[PDB]
Symmetry: D3
Subunit: 205 residues, 6 copies
Amino acid sequence: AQGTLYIVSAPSGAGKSSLIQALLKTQPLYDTQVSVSHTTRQPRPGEVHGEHYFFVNHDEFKEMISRDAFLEHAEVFGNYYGTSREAIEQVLATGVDVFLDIDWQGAQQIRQKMPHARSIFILPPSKIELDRRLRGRGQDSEEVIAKRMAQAVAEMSHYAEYDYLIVNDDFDTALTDLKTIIRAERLRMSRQKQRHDALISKLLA
Amino acid sequence: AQGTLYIVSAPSGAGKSSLIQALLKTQPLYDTQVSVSHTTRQPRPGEVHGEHYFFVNHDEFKEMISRDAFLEHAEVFGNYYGTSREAIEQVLATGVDVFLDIDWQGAQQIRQKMPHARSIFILPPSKIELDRRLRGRGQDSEEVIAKRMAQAVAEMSHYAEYDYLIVNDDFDTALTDLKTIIRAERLRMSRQKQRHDALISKLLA
Amino acid sequence: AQGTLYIVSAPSGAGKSSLIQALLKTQPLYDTQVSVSHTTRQPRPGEVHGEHYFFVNHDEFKEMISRDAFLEHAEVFGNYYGTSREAIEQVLATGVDVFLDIDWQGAQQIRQKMPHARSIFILPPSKIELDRRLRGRGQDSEEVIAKRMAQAVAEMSHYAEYDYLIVNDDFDTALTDLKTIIRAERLRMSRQKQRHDALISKLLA
Amino acid sequence: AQGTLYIVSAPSGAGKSSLIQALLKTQPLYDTQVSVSHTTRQPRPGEVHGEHYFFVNHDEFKEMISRDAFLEHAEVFGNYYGTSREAIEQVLATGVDVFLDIDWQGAQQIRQKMPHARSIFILPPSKIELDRRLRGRGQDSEEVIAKRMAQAVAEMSHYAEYDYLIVNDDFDTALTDLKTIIRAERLRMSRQKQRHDALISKLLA
Amino acid sequence: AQGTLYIVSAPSGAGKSSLIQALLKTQPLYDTQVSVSHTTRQPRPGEVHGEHYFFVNHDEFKEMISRDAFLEHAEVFGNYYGTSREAIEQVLATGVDVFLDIDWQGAQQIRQKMPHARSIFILPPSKIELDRRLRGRGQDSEEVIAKRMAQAVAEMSHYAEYDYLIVNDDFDTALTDLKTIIRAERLRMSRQKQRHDALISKLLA
Amino acid sequence: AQGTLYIVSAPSGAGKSSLIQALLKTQPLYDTQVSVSHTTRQPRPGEVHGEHYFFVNHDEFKEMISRDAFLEHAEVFGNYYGTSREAIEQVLATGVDVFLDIDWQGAQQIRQKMPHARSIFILPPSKIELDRRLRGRGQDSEEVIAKRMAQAVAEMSHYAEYDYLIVNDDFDTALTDLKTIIRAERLRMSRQKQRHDALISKLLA
Ligand SMILES: Nc1nc2c(ncn2[C@@H]2O[C@H](COP(=O)(O)OP(=O)(O)O)[C@@H](O)[C@H]2O)c(=O)[nH]1
Ligand SMILES: Nc1nc2c(ncn2[C@@H]2O[C@H](COP(=O)(O)OP(=O)(O)O)[C@@H](O)[C@H]2O)c(=O)[nH]1
Ligand SMILES: Nc1nc2c(ncn2[C@@H]2O[C@H](COP(=O)(O)OP(=O)(O)O)[C@@H](O)[C@H]2O)c(=O)[nH]1
Ligand SMILES: Nc1nc2c(ncn2[C@@H]2O[C@H](COP(=O)(O)OP(=O)(O)O)[C@@H](O)[C@H]2O)c(=O)[nH]1
Ligand SMILES: Nc1nc2c(ncn2[C@@H]2O[C@H](COP(=O)(O)OP(=O)(O)O)[C@@H](O)[C@H]2O)c(=O)[nH]1
Ligand SMILES: Nc1nc2c(ncn2[C@@H]2O[C@H](COP(=O)(O)OP(=O)(O)O)[C@@H](O)[C@H]2O)c(=O)[nH]1
Ligand SMILES: Nc1nc2c(ncn2[C@@H]2O[C@H](CO)[C@@H](O)[C@H]2O)c(=O)[nH]1
Ligand SMILES: Nc1nc2c(ncn2[C@@H]2O[C@H](CO)[C@@H](O)[C@H]2O)c(=O)[nH]1
Ligand SMILES: Nc1nc2c(ncn2[C@@H]2O[C@H](CO)[C@@H](O)[C@H]2O)c(=O)[nH]1
Ligand SMILES: Nc1nc2c(ncn2[C@@H]2O[C@H](CO)[C@@H](O)[C@H]2O)c(=O)[nH]1
Ligand SMILES: Nc1nc2c(ncn2[C@@H]2O[C@H](CO)[C@@H](O)[C@H]2O)c(=O)[nH]1
Ligand SMILES: Nc1nc2c(ncn2[C@@H]2O[C@H](CO)[C@@H](O)[C@H]2O)c(=O)[nH]1
Ligand SMILES: [K+]
Ligand SMILES: [K+]
Ligand SMILES: [K+]
Ligand SMILES: [K+]
Ligand SMILES: [K+]
Ligand SMILES: [K+]
């Protein structure tokens, strides 16, 4: 009973990390999980090793690439990120659906290796709103913000490669759209044929 | 642009009828409609012509087959039923999603002509429960009930042909399942790219 | 197996009427129905025979009492009302939960004959609010209003006899309360053991 | 104003710990709490003393039994567990409803000492699903899993002693069933007579 | 005490009509009603006198203007429409919130006479979508559609006059938005102080 | 794009801290935040500096007052509390709506400096319930409780200065009332004119 891989991408300031965390709190670990990526970037305050990321040195990441540790890996704004194959295969084979919060470059690598995976792209409801979300608390220089928005513009040009699109205007609407996609996918005949492997056998008698 | 054609089929005793009506009350005529089939069966008490069905004589339906007026037609439960082509094509072109409540024979003909149609099959939660619903008020003979149940079993044989499976155990749940499918499909990239065209242009500088 | 008999009573001005209709629209005829009482009162405008009530003459209702046709009967607000036994027993045996919208006199007679019946009493949120609802469009005389309010107070005296109390302040809340009771009862072990019989056998090797 | 004790039992792999935690996050501490049991078992990673359990040595547990510290205690798969009487009585007398996540042996002891307590049993939706939930991440030997399933089979044979049954097929449905039971129980006339001690006094005037 | 007067205006193609009906089905006649306007336009098929509109002749409506029977009146889409004063004042005095589905001309006259009236404007999600809804079944000429769209644009010019803006993209969302406004207003201090008068007295010793 | 300040006050035992925390978990930080106050009171177990409060010595608080650090400050039951101006102005100017959990004295100071802020007062559903909530786990002396209730009585006399009133009888109802207020306020024409700054421009063409 193999589970389904879900790809979730978005520019910074579309609210993707908060949409996925809120989805996860409604779901037991036997239905849905998130993958823990590897990264070279510094742990932020509040972040714990093995929960959000496995944090590693540049040289250790390199080692991992060279021994084919990764289902996908990429550089994103000055650091490396990747999804280790072993833990993914292991969780999917227990029937769990697994969320991959990754950029468009990782999404592409996943699509070719796992053609069944479903990908969701999240957009902000406008440029004005994107800019206000991107600015955060509002203490970065104009320059640092132009570079941010430019990285976001790059991410967004890749949206058409995804199977679903969520416009995250209003958080609760968008959360509901995300739950709706996963729920609809579980109503697919292949999935249902199984988990319901005969009630159906009992129906056709 | 084009709305999506939905096919919904079910044995009797699966609550499919009330599920579709309930869904329509929450949905504007510009989003979602049901197709008005032609048939030779008699109107039920309190059932208006042109709203549930176009009711015609045996002789009239046979001449409609000759004029090639139907996208599908079939014989179901001792009467003839057909889906007039002109109205489907006309409602779909205005962007409305159109539901076809038709049997498995009909669904096959539509699949061949309209291959992006999506199909929903609806099952009862058990055989005993199927029997309890078919029996209804329990005033019918054992002989009539026997014929309804064999027809139901025969209908259920063809489930594996459909894209989606809903197990209608609890009505509200099954209603949320039908609403869920419709909503997820509207979140697909092909339709969202259309609906949010202006937004996407702005966002990509 | 057997459906559950529900009794619902309330003074007028407690919104009990619309609560029951609203509940029924969300619920199939094979899950939940309302009992059709006989009465001597006139039909209201736009009120059909056999659907809300079986409307009979004073002389006809008196002969129904003699034939022992009622599970309960009583005099309410200057007219006679009764619950025909045959249809209750017949709907209940098909597994349908049946609601009896009857007064306190009726509820006592049913309690004695049918001791697993469950009863719901419905109260207004205050006396002032009760008065505001009773007054309605405010076109009635102070004398008629005076008689409606004494009847309401008399009805409310008998609340402590019922299994459940709903305070109907906010309609949607009170609707969720009525849906909630019905749903919890269906979760009781006696009914769930029946509904999931096949599952339980499998589970226990 | 004494609160209600709720008993929640299930085999491992019916998702009970996750159903109760999610219920609790919707409820303030003046309405609903969980009891903190005593156990001899080792704290898992993430577990904190006094939150999930009071962790104690074998000898300390023994001391507690001998001085009648426990409303119930039992051995469950190679460790001891129990509910201390003092903290329970103290919380219930402040009107809080208290959840006891305990096995069937503890449930029995509670039933005799507190006959008002309501018990809920949770089942998995099938054996296949139970087995997949039981297997977790999927790294235990076949042997260790047969023993797990055998402990689960034992738990499940005791389900008929409970007042309610939840089949935990779909987490959100099952969570809603749990909230529905507590909510229905609060609509009971005894409870309502109190918390609403006169609005009612004001109604009967 | 007094209910609140609501004004709702919208171009056609904003789904305002079905939004108001849908809202009313969830709401008792003692909480919320729609005003019955007089008009000279013909009844639509299946549209009853005194329930949607009081339908009168041109000559009758002109004499109603002379008797000062209207709180507002105006000419809309080639016919005359008016809000009879007596019924508004009479329903409002019984504590009912009354909705006026009227155009911008009407809303101005009501604002001047009734300055605590609250007003809701409803917009379509885009021009293309507005066009798609106006076109409807697509059987009208390009000339008629042209006149409907100029009327819609003219109506939308006056939006900035209203207290509240609802963008009706997704029906259920827009329905929740209309329910939300009504509910928040009932939470204002002036109305809550009235509704919970007895409670507040007790609470303040 | 300036955000809206929300004031939330209540006596102890109306459940205000739990209502606000639950609201916040549904909202991303770019829509809604809570302010972190300064206080001289001791950190409770579980409390962390900079999350719930900035904890400071009596002398440091004094320093802050003397250099005009505070938008509002006050003494509440033997300790000082205040909201620093800088962090507030900074967050509001990024378009975030900010919740201020403060007493009636702070509310007043905020009202004069920021006349756009919206204030919500929460009441317990009765004195009996207030007293039971105030008593907590139930281990304080009668005397300590009379003083508690007396501080609560003082808070409650100031309720009429607030724009909204929530009666927190049932947690989920009250949470929904709180979400409804914020949501309604976002439907106001001033707010909507902006975030929707032309779709509208595109509508009037
Ligand atoms: N290819 C790939 N991208 C990743 C992976 N993990 C995170 N990212 C991307 O890294 C980007 C920034 O991540 P992060 O430092 O956590 O900031 P944030 O997620 O926007 O708050 C996001 O677009 C992620 O999609 C990964 O394992 N593989
Ligand atoms: N193929 C075909 N079947 C139809 C059509 N309309 C209705 N049916 C089927 O014939 C059966 C109709 O039963 P009906 O008289 O409406 O009673 P119902 O089952 O409660 O709807 C159902 O299975 C429908 O799916 C049609 O247009 N074409
Ligand atoms: N005991 C008895 N009372 C009934 C029966 N049917 C209706 N009633 C009661 O008589 C009253 C009927 O009022 P009705 O004419 O229907 O106006 P309503 O109050 O809005 O329903 C209500 O209190 C009902 O409970 C019945 O079958 N038996
Ligand atoms: N009798 C009794 N059983 C308990 C008590 N606390 C926990 N248990 C049972 O111990 C079993 C396993 O508990 P645990 O080690 O926490 O694993 P888990 O709850 O399945 O994740 C469950 O069936 C509980 O019902 C208790 O205080 N008394
Ligand atoms: N001012 C004024 N306008 C009204 C009144 N009643 C309806 N209208 C407006 O006239 C138009 C009526 O259109 P109608 O014939 O009902 O078709 P509809 O647009 O689907 O409701 C709408 O814009 C209404 O707002 C009224 O009493 N006074
Ligand atoms: N004026 C003002 N009051 C505050 C501030 N922060 C907290 N309070 C008030 O202090 C009172 C007690 O706070 P606390 O010690 O946290 O107890 P609790 O909030 O009831 O659990 C509450 O009424 C708050 O409204 C503040 O920054 N300014
Ligand atoms: N406008 C705004 N966005 C914020 C603030 N704090 C965090 N964010 C955004 O919230 C998201 C983090 O979940 C990012 O898009 C941040 O930039 C704030 O104070 N204002
Ligand atoms: N069990 C049962 N099913 C019914 C009753 N009335 C209608 N039905 C069923 O409800 C469905 C129509 O809503 C059909 O499947 C009918 O057979 C009844 O009294 N009992
Ligand atoms: N306050 C008020 N109650 C009404 C009105 N019309 C009907 N009702 C009440 O609404 C209920 C019927 O739905 C009854 O309790 C009626 O008295 C009205 O205009 N105002
Ligand atoms: N199938 C599956 N169940 C898991 C996994 N991780 C945890 N669980 C289950 O989730 C529950 C813990 O809440 C237990 O029933 C675990 O066995 C996993 O990766 N796969
Ligand atoms: N696109 C579309 N709109 C429709 C159709 N039928 C009715 N409407 C629209 O739906 C609304 C009435 O519910 C109006 O705005 C109508 O123009 C249809 O078939 N297609
Ligand atoms: N009745 C009651 N209230 C409690 C208990 N524990 C905490 N609270 C209340 O819950 C609130 C804290 O969120 C305060 O009003 C506390 O007094 C308890 O055991 N019983
Ligand atoms: K990641
Ligand atoms: K059909
Ligand atoms: K009745
Ligand atoms: K426990
Ligand atoms: K009107
Ligand atoms: K604070």
